[PDB]
């Protein structure tokens, strides 16, 4: 439609004689001291914000916006032509692709119309070019970006779930024959090529000469290159559906920065993949900037209601309202809401670990709860324990047709990166999968003695556990070494421990009754007057707590001895299956740390603590 | 004779090497191998003219498979003409030794395709001897006659050129110079210096053509510095095609500080040195410090500040490896022997254990082991070393190193040591967990050279006084107050070298006396009651 000719023109006068306001409305030549580090080769990518052609070019934006290789080619040719007139000496030859270019220039230069014979012009960059996304397009949801945006611009966020080693791929491929004594380049765009036989180099064939060819990596141009799956947010994928993975190719400079588990934001061109009834093809993404999120890393004044209001009364009473009751256990579970984000800058690594666990699954249908618990939290991502084999953390062999070889996979506690995890029917697991489990309790430590596989898993999220019983409640009159079935020293390293019986308490077995019958009757399933609210008032009051950060004092500690002492009649006494250790100590401060967060006040706070110890009397010795 | 297009001399200092015979003159041993000894593949050290000039330095990594020759070629050459009645029959390869240490070995970048690197890690796999045809040479039809062409170096011996015409394998194995070669498939795994844990760490698959395979052992250090390439994997044997993506591989070539230590010495002699170094070394180790006495002297409920205890060593140690059992078999440890149906190529698999010479394996939960298994290990505590009986080996794999733990008939007497965890049943002990670790929570170079520099030439002597000391204690106290009679005491000399090897004394003074005695009354005790 319009003369690539003029465009060309067009970035060459923006790029050197035209100017911006970004340094006090004054032009400070910021791409002309990039464009000089290229010169000098000491920068490798450049980068062209599209930002800055929007502040004073709308028509050039769109175009660009509109299709992207096209001008993404013209740019990067641009700046190659851009590059002869800022050459101020003789390269240093820093590398075996200056060495071939230099030699290749003067071979140039030395003989000085066919419009195959030239050098291409990927062959002679030495410099790679990428896009930022302008901020005026909003972000896409990964759903949302259908056939119909192919060839367009798109950024979407999503969470790495597979990433491969670093590998070379090859772009420009060099022949040389032992007849003609040329370099015959074959260009390659494709995943796979198809190397030369015969060459079609004019010379060979009006002689008639051998013609035989050797491929050779001396010369050839390489470029990083990665292959990568992203899944979409699971907090803004709608409730009836799974989040969908979409592949994304990034190669250069660019490599090397996504982390498996990582948010990141994604900026590339929408392009097909031939695999050589109707023209079918699959789609990628080939990256151009990728951009990890910061929390990665380790009008009147009565809008807020932060001292006033007691978050107890209204936040917990809003969790999880089908529930038949269990307040005290829902309370509990605000603590694992909350987990260890939010820690002190001290080094307090293990405070972000909160590994509960739940014994009796048929009991009051808490398997329901678990959706509860990843719906409303933020950063926190749903998991099955039971979503697959053993095979799933480890490396097998199985049929596959799309792509995949030497497959490395993590299970679902890789899949949770530092959010919340969980775990379903963790009885069925099998006895290896078991000791997988308790690698992970010893903070990090998964050694595998498999001659193929040597990995370190990075386990930082926090593991809810639940635990069917042993084929029926369990029975006082059955001593130890019967009584429980599940391993006890597996037990002794989680730090809380739940178990419900369903016991005929007629007080209680009244309540169960009175809640089924108000079901069927109308809509509102919590008759307490709660409206279920909208996820995003509650969302935003929450993230800003988080930048407080308020720190418990070390000097209260000293009244939390006393209680260990108490414990230890009691524990020698009873003689009880249950037993329990210093650990308690371990876990009474990390349980205190989160309380304190609802007061921000940290100078004198003895009730917040006082109950954490009164939430572990009340579940061990109920009778 | 020569072509141009790469611009290289001979050694390019010929006008320099004439005054440099008259002016070096006016390291012996680098000098006299060559001319009394007469051994092949000189072993040239590293390239110290970057010291004095870059350029020549940078000239022989650009384009090393065009170098290497040069100094070969060049250094025969000159040998030939001074020395006629020398050996020429046995080429001689220049191998550079050392060479400069690649900056960021983690971060090998793709644009470094063909230069010499430096790698650093250990041998886990190695494979059987794989020959293959090199300098290949084709057959014509007139009256079979070959002329010899192909000297120069450049040509590539393709393959599918053999499936016509297979007398090759009879005819031409020797007389066309077809003999097979030597490569050996060895896979390297890089040590990252104690990362934080991030990436995973990269797998280098070591095979070059190079037939100095096995001259060097595997199973040890590697400081190989070898060339990169890169091959073009075929999509399907049937087709053609072959994809946009190379495997790496690596070529195989390759053959103040002491001003502190006297410091140490001065400071040993005051009396509080106990009280200085127990506090120091160590502090994130909770109470029950008889405990300490394996570790400290020695380097030098469950999981109750033990299995920690270990992580400590992991920790502070890198040589070793950590495991458990109750899910590894007897065969998960080691002699996991097997090979690849896929492939159709046996693996001489080791393990673990086998690999722990020269360190300390941590080992836990001994109790839950079964039978089965523990034969191993009764070997190399009894025997020191540890045998590998399957049926492509039998033989034994030197175990010299030690292993402890601990633990919670009398047929016992197997183990080295033997303690066990009493309660003093005391709360206030309790007490100080929240204020010295909850409270609480460029030196790291120094502590890492006490190990390897100073330990390395230290050998303790005992002296004729000291030794019976230990025999005329156990008899007459023995029965004052009412098992010592084996010679189970005598061999807790091996220990005593621990007190020698603190202030790197070779001499035996009042401190490290009654050291020994009371660790009598620590074991009495635990074997009491």
């Given at each position: 439609l319009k003369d690539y000719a003029l465009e060309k023109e067009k970035v060459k006068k923006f790029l050197q004689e035209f100017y911006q306001d970004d340094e006090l409305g004054k032009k400070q030549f910021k791409y002309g001291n990039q464009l000089v580090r290229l010169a000098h080769r000491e920068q490798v990518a450049l980068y062209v914000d599209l930002d800055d052609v929007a502040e004073d070019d709308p028509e050039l934006v769109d175009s660009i916006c509109e299709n992207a290789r096209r001008y993404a080619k013209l740019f990067a040719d641009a700046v190659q032509e851009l590059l002869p007139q800022y050459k101020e000496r003789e390269v240093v030859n820093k590398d075996v692709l200056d060495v071939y270019i230099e030699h290749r220039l003067m071979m140039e230069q030395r003989s000085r119309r066919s419009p195959q014979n030239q050098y291409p012009a990927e062959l002679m960059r030495r410099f790679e070019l990428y896009f930022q996304?302008?901020?005026?397009?909003?972000?896409?949801?990964?759903?949302?970006?259908?056939?119909?945006?192919?060839?367009?611009?798109?950024?979407?966020?999503?969470?790495?779930?597979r990433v491969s080693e670093v590998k070379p791929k090859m772009v420009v491929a060099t022949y040389t024959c032992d007849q003609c004594g040329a370099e015959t380049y074959q260009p390659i765009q494709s995943p796979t090529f198809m190397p030369?036989?015969?060459?079609?180099?004019?010379?060979?064939?009006?002689?008639?000469?051998?013609?035989?060819?050797?491929?050779?990596?001396?010369?050839?141009?390489?470029?990083?290159?990665?292959?990568?799956?992203?899944?979409?947010?699971?907090?803004?994928?709608?409730?009836?559906?799974?989040?969908?993975?979409?592949?994304?190719?990034?190669?250069?400079?660019?490599?090397?920065?996504?982390?498996?588990?990582?948010?990141?934001?994604?900026?590339?061109?929408?392009?097909?993949?031939?695999?050589?009834?109707?023209?079918?093809?699959?789609?990628?993404?080939?990256?151009?900037?990728?951009?990890?999120?910061?929390?990665?890393?380790?009008?009147?004044?009565?809008?807020?209601?932060?001292?006033?209001?007691?978050?107890?009364?209204?936040?917990?009473?809003?969790?999880?309202?089908?529930?038949?009751?269990?307040?005290?256990?829902?309370?509990?579970?605000?603590?694992?809401?909350?987990?260890?984000v939010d820690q002190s800058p001290r080094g307090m690594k293990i405070r972000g670990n909160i590994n509960i666990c739940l014994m009796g699954d048929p009991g009051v249908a808490k398997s329901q709860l678990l959706s509860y618990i990843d719906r409303l939290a933020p950063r926190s991502q749903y998991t099955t324990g039971r979503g697959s084999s053993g095979v799933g953390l480890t490396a097998a062999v199985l049929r596959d047709s799309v792509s995949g070889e030497l497959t490395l996979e993590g299970g679902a506690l890789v899949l949770a990166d530092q959010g919340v995890c969980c775990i379903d029917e963790f009885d069925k697991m099998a006895e290896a999968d078991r000791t997988a489990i308790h690698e992970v309790m010893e903070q990090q430590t998964i050694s595998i003695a498999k001659a193929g596989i040597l990995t370190t898993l990075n386990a930082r999220c926090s593991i809810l556990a639940a635990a069917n019983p042993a084929y029926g409640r369990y029975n006082p009159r059955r001593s130890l070494e019967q009584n429980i079935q599940l391993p006890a020293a597996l037990l002794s390293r989680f730090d809380l421990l739940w178990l419900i019986q369903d016991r005929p308490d007629r007080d209680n077995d009244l309540r169960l009754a009175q809640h089924i019958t108000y079901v069927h009757q109308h809509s509102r399933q919590p008759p307490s007057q709660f409206e279920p609210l909208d996820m995003k008032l509650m969302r935003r009051y929450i993230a800003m707590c988080r930048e407080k950060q308020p720190m418990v004092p070390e000097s209260l500690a000293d009244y939390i001895t006393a209680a260990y002492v108490e414990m230890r009649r009691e524990a020698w006494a009873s003689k009880d299956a249950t037993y329990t250790s210093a650990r308690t100590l371990l876990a009474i401060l990390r349980l205190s740390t989160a309380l304190a967060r609802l007061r921000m006040v940290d100078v004198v706070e003895k009730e917040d603590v006082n109950e954490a110890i009164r939430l572990m009397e009340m579940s061990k010795d109920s009778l | 004779l020569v072509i141009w297009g790469t611009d290289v001399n001979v050694a390019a200092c010929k006008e320099n090497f004439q005054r440099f015979l008259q002016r070096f003159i006016d390291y012996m041993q680098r000098l006299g191998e060559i001319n009394v000894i007469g051994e092949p593949f000189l072993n040239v050290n590293c390239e110290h003219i970057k010291s004095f000039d870059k350029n020549l330095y940078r000239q022989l990594i650009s384009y090393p498979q065009e170098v290497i020759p040069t100094f070969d070629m060049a250094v025969n050459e000159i040998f030939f003409d001074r020395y006629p009645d020398s050996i020429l029959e046995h080429q001689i390869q220049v191998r550079p030794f050392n060479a400069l240490k690649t900056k960021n070995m983690r971060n090998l970048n793709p644009e470094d395709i063909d230069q010499l690197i430096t790698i650093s890690g250990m041998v886990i796999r190695t494979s059987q001897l794989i020959p293959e045809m090199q300098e290949a040479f084709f057959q014509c039809q007139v009256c079979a006659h070959t002329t010899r062409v192909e000297m120069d170096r450049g040509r590539i011996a393709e393959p599918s050129v053999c499936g016509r015409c297979h007398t090759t394998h009879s005819m031409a194995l020797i007389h066309n110079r077809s003999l097979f070669?030597?490569?050996?498939?060895?896979?390297?795994?890089?040590?990252?210096?104690?990362?934080?844990?991030?990436?995973?760490?990269?797998?280098?698959?070591?095979?070059?053509?190079?037939?100095?395979?096995?001259?060097?052992?595997?199973?040890?250090?590697?400081?190989?510095?070898?060339?990169?390439?890169?091959?073009?994997?075929?999509?399907?044997?049937?087709?053609?095609?072959?994809?946009?993506?190379?495997?790496?591989?690596?070529?195989?070539?390759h053959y103040f500080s002491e001003?502190?230590?006297?410091?140490?010495?001065?400071?040993?002699?005051?009396?509080?040195?106990?009280?200085?170094?127990?506090?120091?070394?160590?502090?994130?180790?909770?109470?029950?410090?008889?405990?300490?006495?394996?570790?400290?002297?020695?380097?030098?409920?469950?999981?109750?500040?033990?299995?920690?205890?270990?992580?400590?060593?992991?920790?502070?140690?890198?040589?070793?490896?950590?495991?458990?059992?109750?899910?590894?078999?007897?065969?998960?440890?080691?002699?996991?022997?097997?090979?690849?149906?896929?492939?159709?190529?046996?693996?001489?698999?080791?393990?673990?254990?086998?690999?722990?010479?020269?360190?300390?394996?941590?080992?836990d939960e001994f109790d839950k082991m079964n039978e089965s298994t523990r034969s191993v290990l009764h070997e190399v505590m009894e025997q020191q070393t540890l045998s590998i009986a399957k049926a492509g080996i039998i033989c034994q794999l030197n175990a010299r190193t030690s292993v402890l733990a601990a633990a919670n008939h009398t047929l016992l007497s197997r183990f080295d040591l033997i303690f066990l965890l009493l309660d003093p049943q005391d709360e206030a002990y309790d007490r100080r967990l929240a204020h010295h670790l909850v409270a609480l929570y460029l030196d790291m170079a120094v502590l890492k050279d006490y190990i390897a520099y100073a330990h390395s030439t230290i050998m303790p002597r005992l002296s004729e006084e000291a030794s019976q000391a230990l025999i005329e204690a156990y008899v007459d106290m023995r029965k004052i107050g009412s098992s010592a009679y084996p010679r189970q005491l005598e061999s807790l000399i091996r220990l005593a070298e621990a007190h020698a090897k603190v202030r790197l004394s070779n001499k035996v003074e009042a401190i490290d006396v009654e050291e020994a005695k009371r660790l009598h009354r620590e074991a009495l005790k635990q074997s009491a009651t």
């Open positions: 996304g302008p901020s005026s397009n909003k972000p896409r949801v990964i759903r949302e970006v259908r056939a119909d945006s192919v060839g367009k611009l798109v950024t979407v966020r999503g969470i790495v779930t030369l036989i015969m060459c079609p180099s004019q010379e060979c064939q009006t002689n008639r000469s051998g013609g035989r060819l050797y491929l050779q990596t001396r010369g050839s141009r390489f470029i990083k290159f990665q292959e990568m799956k992203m899944q979409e947010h699971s907090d803004q994928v709608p409730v009836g559906n799974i989040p969908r993975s979409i592949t994304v190719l990034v190669e250069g400079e660019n490599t090397r920065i996504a982390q498996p588990g990582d948010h990141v934001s994604v900026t590339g061109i929408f392009l097909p993949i031939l695999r050589t009834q109707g023209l079918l093809s699959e789609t990628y993404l080939e990256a151009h900037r990728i951009v990890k999120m910061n929390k990665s890393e380790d009008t009147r004044e009565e809008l807020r209601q932060i001292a006033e209001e007691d978050f107890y009364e209204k936040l917990a009473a809003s969790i999880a309202p089908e529930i038949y009751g269990h307040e005290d256990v829902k309370k509990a579970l605000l603590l694992l809401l909350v987990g260890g | 070669s030597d490569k050996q498939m060895i896979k390297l795994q890089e040590s990252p210096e104690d990362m934080p844990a991030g990436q995973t760490p990269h797998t280098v698959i070591l095979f070059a053509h190079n037939d100095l395979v096995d001259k060097v052992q595997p199973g040890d250090r590697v400081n190989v510095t070898g060339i990169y390439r890169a091959v073009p994997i075929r999509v399907n044997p049937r087709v053609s095609n072959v994809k946009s993506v190379y495997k790496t591989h690596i070529d195989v070539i001003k502190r230590v006297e410091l140490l010495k001065e400071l040993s002699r005051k009396p509080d040195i106990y009280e200085r170094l127990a506090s120091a070394l160590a502090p994130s180790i909770y109470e029950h410090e008889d405990i300490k006495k394996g570790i400290l002297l020695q380097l030098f409920d469950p999981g109750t500040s033990k299995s920690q205890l270990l992580q400590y060593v992991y920790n502070l140690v890198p040589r070793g490896q950590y495991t458990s059992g109750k899910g590894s078999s007897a065969v998960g440890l080691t002699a996991y022997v097997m090979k690849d149906p896929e492939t159709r190529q046996l693996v001489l698999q080791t393990g673990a254990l086998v690999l722990s010479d020269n360190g300390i394996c941590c080992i």
